[PDB]
Design a protein around this ligand. Sequence first.
Ligand SMILES: Nc1ncnc2c1ncn2[C@@H]1O[C@H](COP(=O)(O)OP(=O)(O)O)[C@@H](O)[C@H]1O
Ligand SMILES: [Li+]
Ligand SMILES: [Mg+2]
Ligand SMILES: [Mg+2]
Length: 175
Amino acid sequence: PEFMLLPNILLTGTPGVGKTTLGKELASKSGLKYINVGDLAREEQLYDGYDEEYDCPILDEDRVVDELDNQMREGGVIVDYHGCDFFPERWFHIVFVLRTDTNVLYERLETRGYNEKKLTDNIQCEIFQVLYEEATASYKEEIVHQLPSNKPEELENNVDQILKWIEQWIKDHNS
Ligand SMILES: Nc1ncnc2c1ncn2[C@@H]1O[C@H](COP(=O)(O)OP(=O)(O)O)[C@@H](O)[C@H]1O
Ligand SMILES: [Li+]
Ligand SMILES: [Mg+2]
Ligand SMILES: [Mg+2]
């Protein structure tokens, strides 16, 4: 992988849509580095403030950017986070917003043990297409794509289509 130009990919969308499942499988099958922003924030304790209503530490956005910037500059990173408005626009060559039918997403999040308030917040987030709109506001239209993420066959199609995009991008950028 040394001395190859490699792309960076954002996987975004409501909690429960399948970002981590897709990201880890993509990294295994491409050799690109997988980064879970929530896990990274946990491991490196990148928090500032506590959110009273949602009951969780608040992500320190500047510190996350500082933590990751050098790696992103070097390329070949798949980043997984529900949001995207604070990332430098230059980081990503393509952005995928995974989408899940509300009925399907609810069962996933219920299985996680989310309580009523948290289930409702996330379910509304998806039905209002909040994170899709956040992606389109933050990145060029042409590099933002919605991916269906309801069934295992769709996960496989998503993996296949992205692996193929990665191969073409690498060819196009290592003439
Ligand atoms: N395309 C899919 N089809 C069926 N189940 C899926 C799909 N993608 C993810 N899942 C399942 O949905 C749950 C949430 O996926 P996860 O990758 O943790 O979501 P996120 O990281 O977006 O919160 C997991 O149980 C996972 O196995
Ligand atoms: Li969550
Ligand atoms: Mg090489
Ligand atoms: Mg996840």
